[PDB]
Design an enzyme around this catalytic site. Structure first.
Site, PDB file in Angstrom:
ATOM      1  N   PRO A  95       0.777  -1.244   0.000  1.00  0.00           N
ATOM      2  CA  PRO A  95       0.000   0.000   0.000  1.00  0.00           C
ATOM      3  C   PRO A  95       0.802   1.284   0.000  1.00  0.00           C
ATOM      4  O   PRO A  95       1.926   1.366   0.493  1.00  0.00           O
ATOM      5  CB  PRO A  95      -0.783  -0.104   1.310  1.00  0.00           C
ATOM      6  CG  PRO A  95       0.216  -0.742   2.243  1.00  0.00           C
ATOM      7  CD  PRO A  95       0.952  -1.763   1.378  1.00  0.00           C
ATOM      8  N   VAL A  96       0.163   2.318  -0.540  1.00  0.00           N
ATOM      9  CA  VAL A  96       0.718   3.670  -0.563  1.00  0.00           C
ATOM     10  C   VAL A  96      -0.310   4.602   0.059  1.00  0.00           C
ATOM     11  O   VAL A  96      -1.484   4.561  -0.311  1.00  0.00           O
ATOM     12  CB  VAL A  96       1.021   4.108  -2.012  1.00  0.00           C
ATOM     13  CG1 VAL A  96       1.490   5.560  -2.059  1.00  0.00           C
ATOM     14  CG2 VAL A  96       2.042   3.161  -2.695  1.00  0.00           C
TER      15      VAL A  96
END
Lengths: 123, 123, 123
Positions: B62-63
């Site tokens: 994830p970002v």
């Protein structure tokens, strides 16, 4: 296409110009959008603002967000991811495995060109 | 604070709700914004749209992009990166080492609340 | 100018078209950009994906990110924030106080159109 490239500070003006030229060429080659329609924002962030694994480091970057009108094929998206990544790895001397690309698809009822919807305009 | 979270599709609804709760709590703890000011926006990407190293893989994620009114101290930003990273890793069962957090500061002349600038509102 | 607008799902196609028309007009009015230069990206999010205060609610939205080439003055940006916010509140029947605008000024060395930098192009 609208590409946002998250970068650390400090790349030279000439490298940023070369990156804009090369990422535009990669986008035209991969998905066939007219060059004039390709907009790029390079978003430099200070070192205080960049995290990987919970700690500060520029090695979290580059991250590219590519916003496209809906309808590109899986093959076109795969090519865009490959060619944008190869281009930034070469131009900025960044390791290929540190490069991320995230595509957002925008429905043609949801995309505005000059105040009219893309669907109104036949896209 | 406004957080855009890039994550793959397929996480259960309750996991997404737990992520929204936990990222809000982490933002409150780390920078002291009131919870009612924290917006969490989860953007789920299909696997056709996610690249790492030029290849299709959900391992790119994830970002988190955290959009803040400018003015937080370096220590606050460091704490925000640490706590958001720990939280998303725990809630999503994602590796901490795969988690990226980028903070974007918005000058108070450039941030609008209810049509007024943050500067005019004393922020 | 490039506007990304985060919205809940469910607004009718005609309301999204009206929103594209109105936010383009506000941008022309506030900052002097020709209408044809204004690109709008509406990003709808499912209800399971939108949080305010740690809980799910469409009241976290709308959020408008306005990407501009640097150069507009604080006065022009204040006008843009007011007019974009009034416009989206009116078109979508959202409370004005729920509107958020984040202007991202991009330096002219850092923005690309058609493969050339904004500075190369005279912007």
């Amino acid at each position: 296409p609208t590409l946002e490239v998250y970068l650390p500070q400090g790349h030279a003006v000439e490298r940023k110009a070369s990156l804009i030229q090369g990422l535009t060429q990669a986008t035209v080659d991969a998905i066939g959008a007219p060059a004039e329609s390709v907009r790029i924002l390079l978003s430099e962030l200070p070192a205080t603002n960049i995290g990987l694994g919970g700690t500060l480091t520029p090695s979290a970057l580059p991250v590219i967000i590519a916003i496209l009108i809906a309808g590109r094929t899986d093959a076109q998206k795969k090519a865009l991811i490959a060619q944008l990544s190869e281009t930034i790895a070469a131009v900025l001397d960044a390791p290929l495995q540190s490069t991320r690309v995230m595509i957002k698809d925008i429905p043609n009822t949801d995309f505005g060109i000059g105040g009219q919807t893309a669907r109104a305009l036949g896209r």
